[PDB]
Symmetry: D3
């Protein structure tokens, strides 16, 4: 598959996915969604990639939105399918068995907010903006926004942001817990690489399985969630990395 | 019904609902609950109401608890029933297809905290306090408190509050996410109206369906939640507002 | 059973449980978990005990992890069993029908973070640290970490903490809601005891039933949750406490 | 409220609700749905009614369907509301705190199948037919059918009946567990009255609370469901009927 | 502990547990529940035991109810506690990591129905009867009845059985899936033992992990359920049994 | 892709998919799974396919297990992965917006039982058998068996089958609801086509949305489920087929 709107780069144990539609401020569309699905595949096909960073081209936009020309003419049944497909790709991102960090370098609006929310971790530049303008365009959020925002920052804030369609600055995104950290633009990528390298310095199956345990156990009652964990915890004791690391830990007396 | 404890008004497309019992610091009682039921009903039927502000008369109080005289003589089967009827009113408010803003202007305690939590959005004046004193009275929270506080502020704070029965102030309410914002007493209704108007300026089917999606999807696993979203998203494409707002936006975007 | 990792004391109506392995930094091993279960069962039968405070001993540690010697040679099926047994002990603490306050007096890592997350209310001293080292050792959290953290601090932060395995100070911990308060070492137990003491002054059946409604209601959808509450609320009307606190309250306030 | 299309009769401890649009084979419509909501109220307002029987007028139809003239012109947003309202009334029926038995005397198609499925218990005459024709009319079931049928007879059969829109006879309804018993037309009402009188010879709060425990606990995980039961079980020991009946049971030695 | 309501025997790799209160019709009282919990814990630690058969003694009764003398004077809070303790015993049986077969040899009412529903597999003798008398005594089921029956036989039938309190014969019981088989008295234990024996010939880790996946997966949504399975499936690949059964199977079948 | 183990055909608007490996009794293997993935994909894209029949070549077999040679050498982390990939294919089939009919014409064991259960509707020839032998091979069911059988036939039968590893015949499959119907071997495809054609004769958006509602609503509490229905119901009123089928029906009804 050819790659017009997205850049995959690999080096060491981390991949960087860069949305790159510099004219339309990195907005999503049919094609850019297909390209993202494809790269998610590449990434899951490679077991030497242990952590991902998703970012936007340039200094102004992470992902501005989705293309409205594409959406304006759709009927009920088409829009529904268009919702299912974007959700398919973002859900795939969320479940991807490597950690994905969203390096939110500017505008994250609409589908851009939604795709950032689909990552494991969000950090922002100080210039970053977050919002869901969809309801001013006569629609709901369409790529999960009605679900991941409340789960991430609580019903109170989610509802306000979604019903008003008003943006918030980086500092406020931090106050409500939508991002984990805020830094200066010139520090964004270094900070994501440092978090990514800490993650990748850890044991991959444990990170892999911990991600699954959090993602899945969060969907259900606490007793079945906790059982889920012990099953995954068991699996870890079948690996080299488990014995080696617990061993070298006990090289503590030296 | 002629209302004695509740004032219902319409400014623009926003309903303003005010609990007013100056003898009792706007405390709930049966009568007040039945009046509130009635006005939620009126607001349901009124296609000219697109958003709601819920508030309390006066400067001291939002809603300060609930009439204890009505409750003292109840047996187990009567208390049960009383908890069910109150919860019903509040659930009904929670689910109202118009968004609801609690403008918390004073004491919000017990039932008062509970009715506020049953709104979509809570904003507060700096003198406001929130608490659940029920456990000092020999009872649990009975109008959804054991369920809604937890969900809105987490298990740690909720358990602290319900178990100690101690009030918090607005700055703390804000810190733990119980409210989205805190402002001076004389800025409260203005900020509420500014929120309400921005909501009302948006596509109403979209707002209505975003609220449903949020309310309902939050109850279930993410996969079914995301699927609910797409059915609601699709319904929006049956509307003029969507066709019109998008057309407008593409043209104006230039 | 006779105890040499865990002290248990009863001060009027509150029990203080202190994990005491000073040289091991109060770390958890099988004997410790076993004794914990015993003391929990002991507190279960003592109706003079209406609240619990859990802390560690000395001034360096709450609980610093779990014994890696017991773990290093475990295999998949034994790993699993370990996980289940720990979780079974911690889950019993979480459900315990008296409120339990973790006074986190210092290091709280891995299993120690997990035990603290298994209490009702967390409170910390400004020296405390929190973390989940597990993935550095080629394992996932094994005593609930993958489930409780994300539930308490949201997915963004839980995922960052578990994938990176880096620690945070008590101030970060309060910011993300992991704890409800930070005080200085010298204030910790007084703070815990004054929280415990307020709890103990309130009606005991009401606090009990509240704990249950919050735990059980939090697992399911809001409608069946709300209905759970009313059944519990009803039960409070069978007690004398309800009759006397509400008779007192009327006359008292006048 | 006036009652054109529905008959409420009370005698002893049982109410009989009779759908009675003999011309349109007892089909539902806006008005008949409002009338059903009203009678549900009357019934819940009367504590001497301990069991309900829902049936259709005449010997041919239980409830044939809903009126299609009413539905044909609706748009997306109207149909959605029309779905919510019918579901509101049937859900109210399902939760009504007295047992409701559906005496299915003939055709139960569409909304008729759906309203029968909303009762606690179904019994049929041998001439009864069951089905969901909606998908041949260009719609889904609209009054719960997509939910109660699978829950009642399993996904396999529900899907077949719903995707094909083909009817099944009484004997087959019995084989898949959609009804509990099949009898001759001249025996239908006697059999429903006998089941109703057995129910009503039992202790009303226990039946009341058992209904709630089944309805609610079925919605959630088994641990929170079982906790739900014990709360309700507790409530029972606060009643006369509990002590009297256990006492008179132990008059067993006579 | 030494046992005088419950016999426990070990036949190669299967344990037979027999409730033995011949004169009381094997009824459950607190001492019996207590001993059951003890024997369950005893079977828990015995890894030579890979399956369990539960039955009653003599030819009239499986378990006929629970002792109403212990219950008659209980109040709301004590009722509740009783319910929780029974359920806690039965839930431990349900989750027990060896399969358990109820050989229902006769009467199985109230608590006795409930204990049988708490095993993995039910099998009955043609004389057996099933039922839930509780509502005749002014109580709901107290040891899981309100939850397990509807889960096993569907809502239609569970509701009829609990609201009416009437019993059914073993043939009705098989029809509705309450039991998997009916045999004559003389065949019962052979049938159980041959089921137990097949189970015991199969790989033990696989049966264990299957029991867990079925119990825990059944509580949540299909996607997190499916993911639970794969984690367990993975664990099977850590065992020698998997390696040897699949090496055998190839060569064997040729 | 050129297919070696799967035959894909179109008769009318129905796709017929046939698993065909005469050397191996149509047993699954990796290759066969990838081919099945591919054809589910083709069927997704084909707007001319409105229903699917899944079957096996020959007279002995539907799908008889899965290639054990591929599995024997796997470690824990590889087995996990293998279970995930298989489940994915099957989930994808389960969720396909065209209904799927398993025409079970012979042995359906292990993977074979599992793929059949992942269809919407199961019909069987009288010589058919169903079973899960995985536990004799040292493994759990790994393609959703621990989850789907339970849901389709109940916990009692599912646990019996998975634990014993014993096959049942078609008459028993029918009795426990695993299949909707059983017919002679030479009537099987005819009955399947008759089902498929009746489905296909219906309004396709309605069928498609009924399937979603059923799949998704079954995962959650009834209240949110019913709400999902109404969003889907409403979408149908955006379609001609609804307008047309209703008009037609009102006119023809006369």
């Amino acid at each position: 598959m050819e790659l017009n709107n997205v850049i995959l780069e690999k080096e060491g144990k981390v991949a960087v996915v860069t949305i790159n539609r510099p004219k339309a401020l990195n907005a999503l569309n049919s094609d850019t969604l297909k390209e993202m699905d494809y790269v998610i595949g590449e990434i899951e096909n490679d077991s030497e990639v242990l952590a991902v960073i998703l970012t936007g081209a340039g200094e102004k936009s992470f992902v501005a939105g989705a293309d409205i020309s594409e959406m304006k003419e759709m009927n009920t049944i088409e829009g529904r399918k268009f919702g299912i497909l974007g959700n398919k790709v973002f859900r795939r991102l969320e479940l991807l068995e490597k950690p994905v960090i969203a390096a939110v370098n500017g505008f994250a609006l609409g589908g851009g907010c939604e795709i950032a929310m689909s990552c494991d971790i969000r950090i922002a530049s100080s210039n970053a903006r977050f919002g869901q303008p969809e309801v001013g365009l006569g629609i709901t959020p369409g790529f999960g926004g009605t679900q991941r925002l409340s789960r991430l920052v609580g019903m109170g804030m989610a509802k306000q942001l979604i019903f008003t369609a008003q943006n918030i600055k980086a500092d406020e995104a931090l106050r409500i817990g939508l991002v984990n950290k805020v830094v200066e633009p010139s520090e964004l990528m270094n900070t994501a690489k440092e978090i990514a390298n800490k993650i990748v310095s850890n044991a991959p199956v444990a990170v892999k399985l911990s991600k699954q345990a959090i993602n899945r156990g969060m969907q259900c009652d606490i007793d079945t969630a906790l059982a889920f964990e012990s099953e995954a915890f068991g699996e870890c004791f079948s690996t080299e990395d488990q014995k080696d690391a617990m061993t070298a830990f006990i090289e503590k007396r030296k």
